Amino acid sequence: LRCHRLQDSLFSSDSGFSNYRGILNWCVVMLILSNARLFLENLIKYGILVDPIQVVSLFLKDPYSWPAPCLVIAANVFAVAAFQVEKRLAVGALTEQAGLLLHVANLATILCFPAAVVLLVESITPVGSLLALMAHTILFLKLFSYRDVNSWCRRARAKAASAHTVSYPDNLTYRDLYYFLFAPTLCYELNFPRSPRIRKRFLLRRILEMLFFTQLQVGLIQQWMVPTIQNSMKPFKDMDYSRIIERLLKLAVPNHLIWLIFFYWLFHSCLNAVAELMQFGDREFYRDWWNSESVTYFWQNWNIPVHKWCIRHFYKPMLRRGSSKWMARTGVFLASAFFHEYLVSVPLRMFRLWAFTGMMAQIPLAWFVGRFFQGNYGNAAVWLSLIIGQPIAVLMYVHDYYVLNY
Template sequence: MGDKDKFGATLRRRATITAAKGESKQLNGTNATSVSNSSGKAKRKIQESFTTDSLNEHGKQKNASYDKMRCHKMQESMLSSASGFRNYRGILNWCVVMLVLNNARLFLENLLRYGILVDPIQVVSLFLKDPYSWPAACLVIVSNLFIIVALYTERKLAMGSFGEKYGLLIHSINLSVILCFPVITVLKLPSITPAGGLFALGVYTVLFLKLYSYKDVNRWCRERRHTKARSLCRSLSCPSGQSSENGGQTHVSYPGNLSLRDMYYFIFAPTLCYELNFPRSERIRIGFLLRRLFEMLLLTQLLVGLTQQWMVPIIRSSMKPFKDMDLSRIIERLLRLALPNHLIWLIFFYWFFHSSMNFVAELLRFGDREFYRDWWNSETVTYFWQNWNIPVHKWCLRHFYKPMLRKGVSKWVGQSAVFFASAFFHEYLVSVPLRMFRLWAFMGMMAQLPLAWFVGRYLRGNYGNAAVWLSLIIGQPIAVLMYVHDYYVNNYQDEPLEVEAL
């Protein structure tokens, strides 16, 4: 019994061990299968990723080869405004080269047709008929009398020797005589040439504007001193402080400005608007001064040469078409005259407003050098007249336009009045020296009003700028031909006309 139990127990242990071994084998088989399955998936993933990378590289190569074949994209034409392209320097250089070549051809043609006409000595005869008689210069010297009268009147007004109304009467008489005295002298004295008369009248016109400003500013200072009103301040014209030193510059207050030195500094300063304390530069720059002097001398010779060699022959050849009223030939001569006239006007602008006025300002250490602004960018006629001659514009704004507005005058009426005054002085400076009154300059200036309205209303941007340039290029030669023709008819009608060979 005992042996059977032992034998049965042994069999059961063996069966258990066998079953356990079988289970372990089955588990080992299952693990192996799972491992093999996982390794297979990893291999497939690697194969798939390799296949994807190869496809991407192939696609990139294909796209690269396709991009090599592409040559188009969304873009505007370069000359279109939508392209945003703005670099036209090459076209500007091309215009300059073409202009130089064309002018060189005209210069050569002029020399072949007329020879050398430049004669600097002839310029002297335009100002002097008799080398021992200088009537225009004497007329300029006499102008000092009116300066002394204005200074003496202001001193008496500052001391209270007579009232404001009496002082205004003296100033009005003095200013009226400044305008009338040179006119009577030029018209009654045959020895004054047209060029000499123009120079003298120009000096008297500048003197009139300066003394008018001098009168106004000193009156403003008296009003401020008497009323003690701080609101009556006009820029730097009436400083309230006493004389002091600031940066090497002496500041004066009214009536300490009523001195002969202060008056003549203002008379020679390149400005028309008076102030008690002008901005002053620290020193005179010798290099800058010499450059401006060199420009003045060079451009003076250039102006004389271009006028004698280029303009005078065209003007002479224009007299016969005017006499015969040949409209086609008149237009042809007008267009021929437009280029030299405009070139001379541009040179004169640089000579006067940049070289000459900077030269005088540097000598006097006058600090405000804004004699002009960017008038060449004018898109309206009004902008041009406001920016090409800043001293006159400041005077008109300060002493004429704004006082009219304060009296209740509308802006349009004020602007029209400014153009009217400008037209008067243009005619004054042309008709009196030529001793004839045709009103061409006056009408030309007044024609700027409708032109300004038309350009400002219907033309914008580059079109407006082109209209301003066209009015400058064509308008001036028309006035020149009109005055020259009338002057020729009045003085040289019996002489034979020069007929230009065509």
């Protein structure tokens, strides 16, 4: 009979096959084959140490010598302040405007305090400073959501006053609040879907992933990105467009690989290990941002938590409390650009305003890729927009900081 149907080839541009889970297994197996010996050497070297005990002892025996963990611990006072304000206005005190302005004061403090500290203290490491600011902005967003959720459910109980799952007031416990603090998400919500058990094997796999990709990224930086700069240690702040782009074209690809490894090490390994140590269940940290035939589809699927935050605490409100979805989304990108700048500049005491420029230029870039390319061609366009794109801004900052110091 007819043993020749009229069809089209899999890889072909328009078959619509899309079942390539097994290309990634190839990437995994090649990475293992190509770095396994080195990783085993580095593990049998470093991992035999007593890292947790020695670090906690060396810290506790003399604090104030690392102001970054000092600051990370100091964030607890803002956490507790927000908890206390909520619990006070839970019974009826602090008429709603009072609680609102107390929350606003607390949040503005959470922002302006660690920045002021890292700016007016020289004995702090830029990596520790970045981690401190990261913790503080995560706390800012988490507490913003805490306030909004508690306000919503309180006004719901108020309207009901005109007449297993946890109800409104009985949730305000220290354990609940801290659990929300350390949970891999930015959207507060009672009754977080817990996971049944711990799955020690899964946990171990994720820790191994973290260690592996950490060592691999150290290797990438040391052996591919640093020498390319050491060959000409001259900052960008003084170069001209020609030399800037001539250097960036040589720096791009390794930067992009480092960025991909940041993603996989943080958004899938770290967060999963955390959510496993403390059964959290949800674990939708990212959608298929890769096969994204647009930019507005890339942002809606890279870093899910931040997306659903910007949506249900910053986009939907400014639509119900306003109009002009264009204005709203531009506000989203504006706030995110400010946050990027606050995140990268302040730890390095630079203000070149570059990351802001990149996040903002995303908008014309988005319209460009939307008007011109389509399909897999559009996906390639987005990949280009990622290789040179945004993650080159952080690279420019780190470049002009490294050449100026080493």
